[PDB]
Structure formats: C-alpha cells, structure tokens
Amino acid sequence: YEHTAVIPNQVGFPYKAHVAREGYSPLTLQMQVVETSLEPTLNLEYITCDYKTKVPSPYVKCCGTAECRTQDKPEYKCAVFTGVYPFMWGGAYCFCDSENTQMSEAYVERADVCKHDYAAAYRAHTASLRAKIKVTYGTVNQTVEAYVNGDHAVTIAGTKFIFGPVSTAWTPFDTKIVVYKGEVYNQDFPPYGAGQPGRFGDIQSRTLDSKDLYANTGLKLARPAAGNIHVPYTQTPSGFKTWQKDRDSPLNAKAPFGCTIQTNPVRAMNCAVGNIPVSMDIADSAFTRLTDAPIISELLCTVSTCTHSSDFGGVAVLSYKVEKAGRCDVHSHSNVAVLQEVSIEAEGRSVIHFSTASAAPSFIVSVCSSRATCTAKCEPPKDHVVTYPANHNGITLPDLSSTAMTWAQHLAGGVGLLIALAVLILVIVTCIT
Amino acid sequence: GQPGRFGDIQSRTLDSKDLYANTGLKLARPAAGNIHVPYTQTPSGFKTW
Amino acid sequence: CRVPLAPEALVRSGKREATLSLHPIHPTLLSYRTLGREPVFDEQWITTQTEVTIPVPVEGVEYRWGNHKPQRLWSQLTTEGRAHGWPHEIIEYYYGLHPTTTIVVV
Numbered sequence: 061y062e063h064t065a066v067i068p069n070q071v072g073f074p075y076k077a078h079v080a081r082e083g084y085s086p087l088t089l090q091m092q093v094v095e096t097s098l099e100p101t102l103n104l105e106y107i108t109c110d111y112k113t114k115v116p117s118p119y120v121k122c123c124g125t126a127e128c129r130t131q132d133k134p135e136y137k138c139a140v141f142t143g144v145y146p147f148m149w150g151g152a153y154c155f156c157d158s159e160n161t162q163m164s165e166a167y168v169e170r171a172d173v174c175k176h177d178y179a180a181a182y183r184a185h186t187a188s189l190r191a192k193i194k195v196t197y198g199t200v201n202q203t204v205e206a207y208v209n210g211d212h213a214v215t216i217a218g219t220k221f222i223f224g225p226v227s228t229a230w231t232p233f234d235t236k237i238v239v240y241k242g243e244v245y246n247q248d249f250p251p252y253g254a255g256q257p258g259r260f261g262d263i264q265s266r267t268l269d270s271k272d273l274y275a276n277t278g279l280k281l282a283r284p285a286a287g288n289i290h291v292p293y294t295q296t297p298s299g300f301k302t303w304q305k306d307r308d309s310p311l312n313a314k315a316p317f318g319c320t321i322q323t324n325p326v327r328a329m330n331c332a333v334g335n336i337p338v339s340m341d342i343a344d345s346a347f348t349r350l351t352d353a354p355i356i357s358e359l360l361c362t363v364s365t366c367t368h369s370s371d372f373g374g375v376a377v378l379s380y381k382v383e384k385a386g387r388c389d390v391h392s393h394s395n396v397a398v399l400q401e402v403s404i405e406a407e408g409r410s411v412i413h414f415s416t417a418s419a420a421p422s423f424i425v426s427v428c429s430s431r432a433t434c435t436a437k438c439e440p441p442k443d444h445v446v447t448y449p450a451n452h453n454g455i456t457l458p459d460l461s462s463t464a465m466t467w468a469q470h471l472a473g474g475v476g477l478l479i480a481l482a483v484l485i486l487v488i489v490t491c492i493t
Numbered sequence: 494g495q496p497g498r499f500g501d502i503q504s505r506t507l508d509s510k511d512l513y514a515n516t517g518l519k520l521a522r523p524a525a526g527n528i529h530v531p532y533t534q535t536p537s538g539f540k541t542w
Numbered sequence: 543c544r545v546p547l548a549p550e551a552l553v554r555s556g557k558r559e560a561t562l563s564l565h566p567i568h569p570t571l572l573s574y575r576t577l578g579r580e581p582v583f584d585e586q587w588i589t590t591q592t593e594v595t596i597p598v599p600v601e602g603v604e605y606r607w608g609n610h611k612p613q614r615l616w617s618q619l620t621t622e623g624r625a626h627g628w629p630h631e632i633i634e635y636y637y638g639l640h641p642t643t644t645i646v647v648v
C-alpha cells in the first residue's frame with residue numbers, strides 16, 4: 061500500500077511521517093535529505109580566447125611593383141605603398157629612387173595557448189533534480205540516491221519510494237550563460253556574427269579545434285617612416301583580455317536562495333526552496349502486528365522545561381506503566397512540535413527532546429495507540445546568532461489559545477445582556493398600549 | 494583586552510612578573526615534508542594604534 | 543601554488559545585525575550575501591582596520607573572508623525582555639517578531 065508525504069527540501073532538517081493500519085503496531089519513519097543538484101541541459105554556441113597578430117616578412121621590391129593574390133584566411137589584409145627609401149645597415153637596401161614599392165601583409169589568428177584556457181558561452185535550458193535521503197525507521201537505516209522524475213524508483217527490502225513530480229522550477233540560471241574556469245555569469249553575449257571589436261569575444265570559434273574561425277579585430281595598416289623597415293599596424297587591443305579585468309561579480313556569489321554553484325560540470329547543489337512529494341509502498345518485514353508490541357495505558361506523562369532555541373532545548377519527561385518490556389515509537393500529531401527521539405524503549409520512565417520556539421507549544425504526543433497532551437512555558441534564549449540552521453518549521457507563532465490568550469476570555473466584554481435587559485424594558489413599555 | 498585594539502597586553506608596571514593577554518593565539522598543524530610550526534593570531538595592535 | 547591565509551575575524555552578535563572587525567595584514571576581499579528569495583548582497587575591498595556591519599535575517603547569511611571556507615550565521619530566534627510577564631509585556635514581547643501585525647491588532 062502506497063501513501064503520500066511532504067519533505068521540506070532543506071539539508072539537515074528532520075521530518076516524521078506516520079503510517080496507520082487497523083490491527084498492527086503503529087509505525088513512523090524519519091527522513092532527512094542531504095545531497096541535491098540541478099544539472100541544466102546545456103548546448104553550445106561558441107568559445108573565445110585571446111588572439112595573435114602573425115606578421116610575415118615585408119617583401120620590398122625596388123623599382124618594380126608586386127601584386128598580392130589573396131588567401132582564404134581570416135582578415136588577410138594587403139597593402140602596397142610607393143615612395144619608400146629603406147635604409148638598412150648596408151647603406152640602402154636597393155639602388156633606385158622613384159619606383160620603389162613595399163609590400164606589408166598581416167593576418168589575425170587564434171593564439172596557441174588557449175587550448176587550455178578559454179571562455180565558453182552556452183545556451184541554458186531546463187534542468188533536472190536528484191536527491192539523497194536517509195530513511196531511518198529503526199530497522200536498518202539505509203542511504204539512497206534517486207531522481208525526482210517519478211518513473212525512477214529504488215526499493216530497499218521490498219519497500220519502494222517514488223519522488224516526482226517536483227514542486228517548482230525555480231532556477232538559479234537564465235537562458236544565456238557563459239562559463240570560465242570556475243565561474244558562471246549572466247550577460248547577453250553577442251551572436252555568432254556581431255563581432256563588436258573590443259567587447260566580449262571579438263574572436264569566436266565553434267569548438268576547440270575547428271580549422272575555421274571568425275574575427276573582427278579592427279585591423280589596419282600604415283606607411284612606414286624614413287629609414288626603418290617594419291610593419292606599422294593599428295589595432296584595437298584585446299577584448300577578451302579586457303573582460304578578465306573589467307568584470308567582477310560572478311553568479312557564484314550573487315546566487316539566490318543560498319545555493320552553491322560548482323563547475324565541471326555546471327551544477328548547483330544544496331539549494332533550499334520548495335518541498336518534494338514522496339509516495340512510498342511498504343513491505344511486510346517491519347510492518348509489525350498489534351498483539352506483539354507493548355500494550356500500555358494510563359499514560360501519566362508531563363513536561364519539564366522549555367527554551368526558544370533552534371536546536372534541542374525542550375525537554376519533556378513522560379511516565380507510563382510497563383506491561384511488557386520492548387520498544388515503542390513516538391510521533392507528534394500537530395505541526396507545532398517536532399521530536400528528535402524516534403523510538404524510546406519502554407522501561408520505567410522516558411524522556412523526549414522536543415523543539416519548538418514559537419511561544420509555548422501545547423502539543424499532543426503519542427506512544428503505541430495512546431493519546432495525551434502536554435503544555436509548558438518557554439523563555440527566549442540569550443544569544444543572537446548561532447552556527448546551524450533552524451529545526452522548528454513553525455510559522456505557527458501563535459501560542460494556540462493558552463497561557464497568553466487567557467486575557468481574551470477575561471476581556472470578552474459582557475454587557476450585551478444589559479441591552480437585552482433594555483429591550484425587556486421595551487417589552488414592558490409596550491404592554492400599556 | 495579584546496585582541497587587535499588598544500590594550501591587548503598590559504601589566505601594572507615594568508616588572509609585574511605576570512601579565513594579562515588575550516591575543517587570540519592558536520596554532521595549527523604543519524604541512525608534510527618541511528619542519529616548522531604554524532600559528533595564527535591578530536598582529537600586535539599597539540603598532541596599529 | 544601557495545597563498546597566505548588571513549587572520550581571523552572576531553564577530554560580535556547584535557540584534558539582527560552581526561559586526562565583524564578585520565585586521566588585514568595585506569589588502570584582501572570581503573564577500574557576503576543573504577540567503578532568502580531576495581538576494582541582497584555586497585562585497586568590499588579592505589585595506590586597514592575597519593568594521594563592517596552585515597545584516598542577519600531569519601533566512602540566514604553566508605560570508606567568506608580571504609581564502610577561508612564560507613561561514614554561515616543565523617539569528618537565533620529574536621530577543622526581548624520579559625515574555626508573558628503579566629502586564630502588557632506580552633505586547634512588548636510581540637514588538638519583536640514581525641511587529642506590524644501586532645500594531646494593527648492593538
């Protein structure tokens with residue numbers, strides 16, 4: 061038989077669920093989630109790295125002219141100049157005065173080291189969800205990893221769990237993304253064509269090792285000076301090397317909901333949002349009968365003292381009569397008070413550790429088909445900040461109608477019956493007529 | 494004498510042979526290979542003052 | 543490659559606000575963020591002796607200074623004087639802990 065449960069998706073939080081079946085011992089189970097992740101389905105657009113300006117030798121022709129046949133290459137740029145007088149170490153290079161020409165050619169290419177460092181922009185689509193749970197119910201406690209797709213099921217000792225669907229698609233991502241060595245960023249990177257020179261990725265490559273590429277480096281050439289043989293080339297400096305300095309604030313720090321981002325592969329783990337549903341189907345190895353467990357009565361329990369902690373700082377001792385020694389499991393039946401000790405061995409006395417800091421929890425606890433109630437007062441703590449998350453899920457900050465709302469019954473108000481007496485004076489004034 | 498601010502160490506005079514200190518000193522374990530000793534504390538706040 | 547760790551930061555724990563005071567030996571970086579749906583966040587460069595006052599709501603606050611592990615902090619519940627001590631200290635005790643509803647109630 062299968063039934064539902066809601067598990068609050070926060071790491072370390074304990075949750076209790078109860079199975080009910082007429083004729084057997086009541087059983088409960090404790091669940092605690094540890095590992096989560098959201099692998100997003102990434103595709104590729106293009107990568108970018110630093111560029112380089114390969115400049116071959118400037119072939120000079122004296123009293124002649126050349127003709128530069130082009131090349132299928134990125135931004136192959138040809139320039140032919142007249143009126144040069146190259147003046148090298150050996151006097152002049154050639155001997156002519158008016159027909160001299162100089163040829164300067166240069167191109168822009170992907171640098172040799174960015175096979176190991178590079179940025180890669182991805183398009184970013186919907187993700188998935190995996191979980192790790194602890195399934196302690198006294199009988200042997202297993203750990204489990206499983207998906208949240210619903211179809212995927214994993215069973216221990218004939219007892220199976222299914223998880224999906226999910227409660228929310230609250231993503232710590234966007235549609236467009238860019239990944240560096242250890243960070244992820246969200247800026248709307250330009251398309252494959254728009255190589256704005258000096259912005260992000262003015263060089264683009266569709267993979268690590270494609271033999272074709274694209275560049276818009278903004279490259280031009282100028283005529284040399286008197287004497288010096290060189291290649292004056294004007295260029296916008298790198299945009300990629302600019303982006304390394306002119307962009308702080310990655311998503312690793314700006315991440316919502318306190319989740320944690322880790323690269324290789326791109327994943328976000330231990331997010332804290334929404335709940336997860338779970339349907340569980342039991343087996344008959346620990347689903348124990350009624351006429352075997354302790355059958356007690358006159359559950360003369362009580363409380364001891366209570367604090368407004370965030371951890372186990374509410375202690376409640378509870379007494380009872382032992383009919384036969386064994387173990388029985390306890391469980392709350394309202395949302396105000398959680399318990400820590402799942403199973404207490406019924407022998408003489410007992411003591412439980414409840415945790416609820418809202419005001420003054422009046423909560424019903426139960427042990428082996430038996431119902432009682434407890435109530436106390438609680439003082440606030442003295443500290444201000446601690447090093448562990450909450451343990452009371454209670455937004456139920458109201459005290460539930462006791463020990464501070466008694467003044468409502470005090471200041472009810474009363475006097476409406478006096479106006480009933482006044483309308484009785486109306487009844488006695490109409491008797492004459 | 495909260496460490497780092499003024500008055501992190503003190504003594505009644507130049508010769509009071511016991512002295513107060515709350516310099517937050519703690520020592521950790523060394524890494525393998527080299528023989529040394531690590532230890533961490535806030536620097537001498539007098540020079541900061 | 544080795545890298546120097548930075549000295550510790552002793553926190554001081556006020557009501558909904560935690561103050562951590564740095565003694566940097568080198569110029570370093572401070573980073574912190576809230577934990578809730580609303581991502582309120584900042585980061586700062588630190589050169590000399592200075593205090594920084596970061597908020598702490600109930601949803602939690604993480605921060606990391608230097609090359610350390612990221613550290614978490616959480617307001618415990620709230621603090622006040624005497625709760626349910628009979629005369630009107632109940633409304634004073636509910637002057638903490640989301641007070642706006644209490645004002646419209648009174």
Ligand SMILES: *[C]1O[C]([C][O])[C](O[C]2O[C]([C][O])[C](O3[C]4O[C]([C][O])[C]([O])[C]([O])[C@]43[O])[C]([O])[C]2[N]C([C])=O)[C]([O])[C]1[N]C([C])=O
Nearest residue numbers: 090092194195196197198199200201202203400401402403
């Ligand atoms: C089953 O059941 C149980 C209950 O009792 C549980 O538990 C508890 O838990 C906890 C958590 O984990 C533990 O703890 C551990 O250990 C470790 C080692 O190292 C440490 O570190 C930590 O801290 C802690 O302490 C304990 O132990 C326990 N208890 C008992 C067992 O008794 C569990 O978990 C379950 N499961 C299994 C498998 O066992």
